[PDB]
Structure formats: structure tokens, C-alpha cells
């Protein structure tokens, strides 16, 4: 009936800052902002998709904590399910980070990076940490 679009994002934390990666027009509201990644295979899970991709794609030891939140929306070409996963900073720097530019906002400033409607509620949770 509908095409279940499985996509997973990555949120690297470091010094109370967040990374930015303005992908193509495929991502969610990539015009204003957008996170790195956001693609899952039809065999791998939202998590396995990160541990696998981040492996070669990022070519780093990016560590993962736990699932942030699950968001889904009704699309014409199926259903878009955006999910975030708490990541950690490693020795080497992340990849595809220079895509848009170098900007690290604080936890109480991330709001300025108005993200998609699926990540919006996922980013707000972070603030809870304080």
C-alpha cells in the first residue's frame, strides 16, 4: 500500500555541541537544516545501518548510545520514518561534516537550527539533559 522509507540519522556530541550536515533535497527540510546520513537498507536495521555506514562511510570509531526517538509521517511516495541515535566523539573527526560548513551550536542554541518536523521533537529531547 505504501513504501516504508527507513532512514536513520547521526548526532555526534562533543563539548556540548552538535554537528550540521545539509544533505540534498531528498532529506527532510534540508533547505533550512539537516543531519548527516538518513538512509537505511531493506535488510539492515536503523541501528545496524549506522554501525555499518559510520564504519566505512564515516571511517571513524563513532560510538552509539541509545535510540533517541521514533518519528513517522505520511508521504505520497510512502511513509518517511526519521529516527535519531545518540552518538559520541572519537579521536578522528567525522566525515561529510564540511558539507554545509563548520557550525557548532550549544544545547540551548540548537533551536536556531530549526530541523525537520521529524527531528524537531528528537532534538528537543537533548535539551532535557541540560
Domain ranges of the chain: 1-130
d(CA 50, CA 40): 8
SS (H, E, C) the chain: CCCEEEEEECEEEECCEECCCCCCCCCCCCCCCCCCECCCCCCCCCCHHHHHHHHHHHCCCCCEEEEEEEEEEEECCEEEEEEEEEEECCCCCCCCCCCCCCCCECCCCHHHHCCCCCCHHHHHHHHCCC
1-130 CATH: 3.90.79.10
| Residue 110 to residue 74: CA distance in whole angstroms | 26
For residue 54, report the phi and psi dihedrals to the nearest 5 degrees: -50, -25
d(CA 104, CA 17): 5
The experimental technique behind this entry is NMR
Query: Which run of H or of E encompasses 52?
Result: helix 48-53
Amino acid at each position: 500500500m505504501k513504501k516504508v522509507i527507513n532512514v536513520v540519522g547521526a548526532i555526534i556530541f562533543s563539548d556540548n555541541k552538535i554537528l550540521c550536515a545539509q544533505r540534498s533535497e531528498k532529506m527532510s527540510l534540508p533547505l533550512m537544516w539537516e543531519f548527516p546520513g538518513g538512509k537505511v537498507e531493506k535488510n539492515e536495521t536503523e541501528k545496524d545501518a549506522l554501525i555499518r555506514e559510520i564504519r566505512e562511510e564515516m571511517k571513524c570509531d563513532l560510538i552509539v548510545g541509545d535510540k533517541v526517538i521514533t518519528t513517522e509521517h505520511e508521504y505520497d511516495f510512502g511513509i518517511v520514518r526519521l529516527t535519531t541515535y545518540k552518538c559520541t566523539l572519537n579521536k578522528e573527526l567525522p566525515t561529510l561534516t564540511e558539507h554545509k560548513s563548520i557550525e557548532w551550536l550549544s544545547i540551548n542554541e540548537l533551536d536556531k537550527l530549526n530541523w525537520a518536523p521529524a527531528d524537531i521533537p528528537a532534538v528537543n529531547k537533548i535539551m532535557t539533559e541540560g
